[PDB]
From Swiss-Prot, chain A:
The protein's assembly and partners: Interacts with STH1 and SWI3. Component of the two forms of the RSC complex composed of at least either RSC1 or RSC2, and ARP7, ARP9, LDB7, NPL6, RSC3, RSC30, RSC4, RSC58, RSC6, RSC8, RSC9, SFH1, STH1, HTL1 and probably RTT102. The complexes interact with histone and histone variant components of centromeric chromatin. Probable additional component of the SWI/SNF global transcription activator complex.
GO cellular component: chromatin; nucleus; RSC-type complex; SWI/SNF complex
Regions annotated as coiled coil: none
Function: Probable component of the chromatin structure-remodeling complex (RSC) which is involved in transcription regulation and nucleosome positioning. RSC is responsible for the transfer of a histone octamer from a nucleosome core particle to naked DNA. The reaction requires ATP and involves an activated RSC-nucleosome intermediate. Remodeling reaction also involves DNA translocation, DNA twist and conformational change.
Keywords, alphabetical: Nucleus, Phosphoprotein, Transcription, Transcription regulation
GO biological process: chromatin remodeling; chromosome segregation; nucleosome disassembly; regulation of transcription by RNA polymerase II; transcription elongation by RNA polymerase II
MF terms in GO: DNA translocase activity
Protein name in the entry: Regulator of Ty1 transposition protein 102
Compartments reported by the entry: Nucleus
Misc. comment: Present with 1550 molecules/cell in log phase SD medium.
Name of the gene encoding the protein in the UniProt record: RTT102
Chain segments annotated as transmembrane: none
Cell wall biogenesis/degradation is among the record's keywords: no
Swiss-Prot record, chain B:
Note: Present with 1360 molecules/cell in log phase SD medium.
Species per Swiss-Prot/TrEMBL record: Saccharomyces cerevisiae (strain ATCC 204508 / S288c) (Baker's yeast)
Predominant place of localization: nucleus
UniProt keyword annotation of GTP-binding present: no
Transcription as UniProt keyword: yes
Lineage: Eukaryota, Fungi, Dikarya, Ascomycota, Saccharomycotina
Gene, per the UniProt record: ARP7
GO biological process terms, semicolon-separated: chromatin organization; chromatin remodeling; nucleosome disassembly; positive regulation of transcription by RNA polymerase II; regulation of DNA-templated transcription; regulation of transcription by RNA polymerase II; transcription elongation by RNA polymerase II
Name of the molecule in the record: Actin-related protein 7
Subcellular location(s) of the protein: Nucleus
GO molecular function, one term: chromatin binding
Swiss-Prot record, chain C:
Organism phylogeny: Eukaryota, Fungi, Dikarya, Ascomycota, Saccharomycotina
Subunit record text: Forms a heterodimer with ARP7. Interacts with LDB7 and NPL6. Component of the two forms of the RSC complex composed of at least either RSC1 or RSC2, and ARP7, ARP9, LDB7, NPL6, RSC3, RSC30, RSC4, RSC58, RSC6, RSC8, RSC9, SFH1, STH1, HTL1 and probably RTT102. The complexes interact with histone and histone variant components of centromeric chromatin. Component of the SWI/SNF global transcription activator complex.
Family affiliation: Belongs to the actin family.
Subcellular compartments: Nucleus
Protein name: Actin-like protein ARP9
Other remarks on this protein: Present with 1790 molecules/cell in log phase SD medium.
GO BP field: chromatin organization; chromatin remodeling; nucleosome disassembly; positive regulation of transcription by RNA polymerase II; regulation of DNA-templated transcription; regulation of transcription by RNA polymerase II; transcription elongation by RNA polymerase II
Source organism: Saccharomyces cerevisiae (strain ATCC 204508 / S288c) (Baker's yeast)
Gene3D superfamilies: 3.30.420.40, 3.90.640.60
Outcome of swapping G284L: Impaired heterodimerization with ARP7
Curated annotation (Swiss-Prot), chain D:
Summary of subunit composition and partner proteins: Interacts directly with SFH1, CSE4, histones H3, H4 and H2B, and via its N-terminus, with RSC8. Interacts with LDB7, NPL6 and RTT102. Component of the two forms of the RSC complex composed of at least either RSC1 or RSC2, and ARP7, ARP9, LDB7, NPL6, RSC3, RSC30, RSC4, RSC58, RSC6, RSC8, RSC9, SFH1, STH1, HTL1 and probably RTT102. The complexes interact with histone and histone variant components of centromeric chromatin.
Name of the protein this chain belongs to: Nuclear protein STH1/NPS1
Domain named HSA: residues: 1-69
Function: Catalytic component of the chromatin structure-remodeling complex (RSC), which is involved in transcription regulation and nucleosome positioning. RSC is responsible for the transfer of a histone octamer from a nucleosome core particle to naked DNA. The reaction requires ATP and involves an activated RSC-nucleosome intermediate. Remodeling reaction also involves DNA translocation, DNA twist and conformational change.
Family: Belongs to the SNF2/RAD54 helicase family.
Residues annotated as transmembrane: none
Misc. comment: Present with 1990 molecules/cell in log phase SD medium.
Subcellular location: Nucleus
Residues of the full protein shown: 314 to 382 of 1359
Source organism of the structure: Saccharomyces cerevisiae (strain ATCC 204508 / S288c)
This protein's encoding gene: STH1
Signal peptide per UniProt: none
Length: 54, 398, 395, 69
């Protein structure tokens, strides 16, 4: 099948980004990269039995 | 907690300990020295430095980065050490994550310059977005669960005793002794020098010996007298005479044997000789007349307690002597804590000594790093002074 | 979970061992040995499209792992996507209802390396749960998968002799001392290139076939006869003399020096000796016979604590006038190889050179056949912290 | 007034950092115990995979007489 619909039909949900964050006490005078929660608005197949050892 | 990940870097006098905040053990424990190889090449790391010093190449020179004060003094190679941390060990940009670094307890003068150096090191060189300075005897004290504590960090540079009352460091009573691990590196290598046929520029050879077999002698052959050594021979014979009389031998003459690895030779030292090196931490007059007993650890216990009483003294005395924290890599030798127990109970017999120590061997070497680790995971940034780039920009103005 | 839905990926510098589903009677050899390589088409506008084959000779061959290190974190994860979808298509081709039985909930176990970065491991956590959409993920180290393939001894030492590198890892308390993990850049090719020095008139193919010959052993009968004949990859008979007994000594001496410098910095004396008594030497290189016994004997030669043979012999002459031995205080008094698991039939058949894969089958029978989610991130834990939840499921 | 707020915020900063470290002290004890148990729990599955595959070897050795006849 198509490589994306093999994934979506399988394994049955948020997204995450590695982003700068400025924390609150208001806002601290720095930032830092961390894993911030994404908000609402935020190819090929090898044929098997080719690498099968025999 | 906070959605964060901090960088924890501890620059001790002998070991540069670095790791992350989301882990409990450090990413690396590299030495606080480097081989300058001569073009100049600054070899950092543990295995890269022991292999380069085992080559015994000319032009190689082990140069330290942190002096006996606990302060960094070679800031450019410490930057290159910190570049070796962030890239080769931490594998992260220094601008991505916050930083937490360690400072020794001082009397108050040399902090602002080293803060300005740490301003020049975190911002001007690494572009760390925020770095937090914690005090290493304070960070050790809080990580054991104390806001008021009596911390003694016996490192390689010496003994660093620090009285702490209620979160603030009593700075005028902070005394830093000279006799510690690198001094024990000197004394052990001196007495075994007829037994090993041996007896800066050759500090490539000197630090290599101190990191391979002199560190092996202090970890295995060294025993500290838990009394004074003259008091210990008096105490051990009087108990053995009771053991002989109640039923119907000298414990010094127990031949503790050291297999010297560069020569394949037994180094037979009896237990008094193992007691002899550790005596100089508490009686440094046993090597030279220039060292008072106050310069040793024993009378420096009472001197740091009595100066903290003038921070009403006798409550400060009972505050410290019931909150004794023992830490350091040199304190891992057997009998270190009981000698501090004896030398302080003979100087304060009225007060009962309750001394605490991280009994884990690895965790007491990195207790300054583990002290900064707990401060790196605080769930409020108002719990510690987090030096933003603005905090250097307000220091730049006049 | 269902044990047929269990997926284990062991990616290396050269190859990648893949097995989807446990045999449930005995644990078997990994059948799929895919080379760790992806094909990067430089798509116009700058985008990348990652392929299994050379897409019209516009793709470049990107091997995302060399010497165990991830060098391309997006190309590795898309090569993980390349392998995973190839399992998803084959299970959709073989079973055709696998999306409700074999693919409806897939527990993924990616065997990780010590040299993989924290940002690299977190992008893998970001990739598996968003693009791969896989509901669970174990990021098991290659060091801890090796000691969980053995009898799960509490203190061990891992010597991962690869093709171009050797990873020397101490293990105490089922954990990794990251401040003592070192890796020399000397692997299976160091055995080959030392035979290039001993056999200059040969090529790389005859020496690698000599390294893959059955007559290549290390001394610590082949030993009695001087010359022996092996076969080439093309079937040509080639004679060799005593060079089949050498070529391994430089790698053996360099490992034992790096092992001895690693475990001497363990200040806890009780923890270090059980590491010294549980030496584990693994890798695709380590299929050479006699390599582990001489590497053990070199540790007996360089790091075994004993009274010196000159000092014992003088004292034995002094007793000739019963010998009590000199008692030292240093830790490596006994140096032993760890006992290997001799109860898997298929792993005894195909060798234990890839034994890191076998402990993953035990960990996936430990964690994926038990309801405890303490060592894998769920969909809930990814919706809580994301890749920040990766450092709550580590060993 | 202003003096009551400073002493209480100092006591709150003292007690909370003591409490949060004691939380992370217990987090240090909790994570190491799981590493000890699941390592030995992996050792238990080793003995589980041992006894299942050892009786398979013992049964086929007795069934060699059926192959022998």
């Amino acid at each position: 099948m198509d490589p994306q619909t093999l994934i979506t039909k399988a394994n049955k949900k948020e997204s995450w980004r590695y982003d700068w964050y400025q924390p609150s006490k208001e806002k601290y005078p720095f930032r830092y990269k961390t894993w911030l929660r994404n908000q609402e608005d935020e190819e090929d197949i090898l044929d098997l039995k080719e690498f099968d050892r025999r | 907690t906070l959605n964060r990940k901090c960088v924890v870097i501890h620059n001790g006098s002998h070991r540069t300990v670095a790791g992350f905040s989301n882990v409990e053990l450090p990413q690396c424990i590299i030495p606080s020295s480097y081989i300058k190889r001569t073009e100049a090449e600054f070899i950092f790391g543990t295995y890269n430095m022991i292999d380069a010093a085992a080559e015994k190449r000319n032009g190689d020179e082990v140069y330290t980065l942190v002096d006996s004060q606990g302060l960094p003094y070679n800031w450019d190679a410490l930057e290159m050490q910190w570049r070796y941390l962030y890239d080769t060990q931490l594998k992260v940009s220094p601008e991505e994550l916050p930083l937490v670094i360690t400072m020794p307890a001082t009397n108050g003068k040399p902090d602002m310059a080293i803060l300005e150096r740490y301003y020049e090191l975190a911002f001007d060189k690494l572009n760390v977005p925020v770095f937090q300075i914690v005090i290493e005897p304070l960070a050790i004290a809080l990580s054991m669960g104390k806001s008021s504590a009596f911390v003694i960090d016996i490192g390689a540079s010496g003994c660093n005793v620090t009285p702490i009352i209620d979160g603030i460091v009593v700075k005028n009573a902070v005394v830093r002794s000279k006799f510690g691990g690198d001094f024990l590196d000197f004394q052990v290598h001196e007495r075994l020098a007829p037994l090993i046929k041996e007896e800066q520029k050759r500090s490539t050879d000197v630090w290599y010996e101190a990191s391979t077999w002199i560190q092996q002698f202090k970890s295995t052959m060294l025993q500290v007298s838990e009394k004074d050594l003259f008091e210990l021979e008096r105490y051990y014979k009087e108990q053995a005479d009771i053991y002989a009389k109640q039923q119907e031998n000298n414990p010094l003459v127990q031949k503790k044997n050291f297999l010297f690895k560069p020569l394949n030779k037994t180094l037979t030292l009896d237990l008094k000789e193992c007691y002899q090196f550790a005596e100089y931490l508490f009686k440094p007059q046993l090597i030279s007349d220039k060292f008072s007993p106050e310069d040793g650890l024993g009378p420096l216990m009472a001197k740091s307690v009595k100066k903290a009483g003038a921070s009403s003294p006798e409550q400060v005395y009972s505050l410290l002597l019931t909150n004794v924290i023992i830490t350091g890599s040199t304190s891992l030798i057997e009998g270190m804590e009981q000698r501090i127990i004896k030398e302080l109970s003979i100087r304060f017999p009225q007060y009962k000594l309750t001394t605490f120590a991280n009994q884990v061997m690895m965790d007491r070497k990195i207790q300054g790093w583990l002290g900064a680790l707990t401060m790196a995971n605080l769930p409020s940034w108002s719990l510690g002074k987090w030096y933003s780039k603005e905090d250097y920009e307000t220091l730049k103005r006049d | 979970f269902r044990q047929d839905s269990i997926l284990i990926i062991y990616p290396r510098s050269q190859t990648t061992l893949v097995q989807f589903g446990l045999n449930e009677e005995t644990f078997t050899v990994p059948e799929l040995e895919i080379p760790t390589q992806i094909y990067r088409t430089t798509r116009q506008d700058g985008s990348y499209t990652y392929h299994s084959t050379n897409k019209d000779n516009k793709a470049e061959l990107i091997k995302p792992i060399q010497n165990g290190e991830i060098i391309d974190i997006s190309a590795f994860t898309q090569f993980l996507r390349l392998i995973f979808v190839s399992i998803l298509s084959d299970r959709a081709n073989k079973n055709q209802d696998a999306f409700e039985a074999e693919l409806s909930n897939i527990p993924l176990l990616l065997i990780t390396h010590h040299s993989w970065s924290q940002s690299d491991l977190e992008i893998i956590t970001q990739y598996v749960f968003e693009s791969l959409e896989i509901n669970n993920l174990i990021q098991l180290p290659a060091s801890l998968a090796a000691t969980y393939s053995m009898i799960s001894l509490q203190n061990c030492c891992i010597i991962d002799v690869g093709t171009h590198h050797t990873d020397i890892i101490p293990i105490v308390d089922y954990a990794q001392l990251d401040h003592l993990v070192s890796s020399i850049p000397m692997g299976g090719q160091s055995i080959n290139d030392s035979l290039k020095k001993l056999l200059p008139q040969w090529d790389d193919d005859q020496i690698e076939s000599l390294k893959k010959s059955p007559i290549f052993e290390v001394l610590s009968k082949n030993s009695d006869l001087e010359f022996n004949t092996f076969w080439d990859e093309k079937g040509n008979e080639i004679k060799v003399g005593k060079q089949r007994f050498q070529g391994c000594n430089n790698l053996i001496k360099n490992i034992s020096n790096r092992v001895g410098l690693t475990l001497d910095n363990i200040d806890d004396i009780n923890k270090a000796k059980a590491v010294w008594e549980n030496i584990i030497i693994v890798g695709g290189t380590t299929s050479i016979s006699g390599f582990k016994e001489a590497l053990l004997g070199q540790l007996l030669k360089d790091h075994l604590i004993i009274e010196p043979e000159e000092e014992k012999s003088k004292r034995e002459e002094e007793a000739k006038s019963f010998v009590p031995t000199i008692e030292y205080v240093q830790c490596p008094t006994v140096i032993k190889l760890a006992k290997y698991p001799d109860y898997f039939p298929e792993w005894k058949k195909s060798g234990y050179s890839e034994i890191i894969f076998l402990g993953a089958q035990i960990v996936s029978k430990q964690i994926f056949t038990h309801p405890k989610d303490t060592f894998y991130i769920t969909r809930e834990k990814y919706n809580m912290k994301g890749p920040a939840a990766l450092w709550d499921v580590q060993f | 007034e202003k003096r009551k707020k400073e002493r209480n915020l100092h006591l709150q900063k003292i007690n909370s950092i003591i409490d949060f470290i004691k939380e992370r002290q217990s987090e240090q004890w909790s994570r190491q115990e799981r590493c000890f148990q699941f390592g030995r729990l992996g050792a238990s599955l080793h003995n589980q995979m041992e006894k299942d595959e050892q009786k398979r070897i013992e049964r086929t050795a007795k069934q060699r007489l059926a192959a022998l006849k």
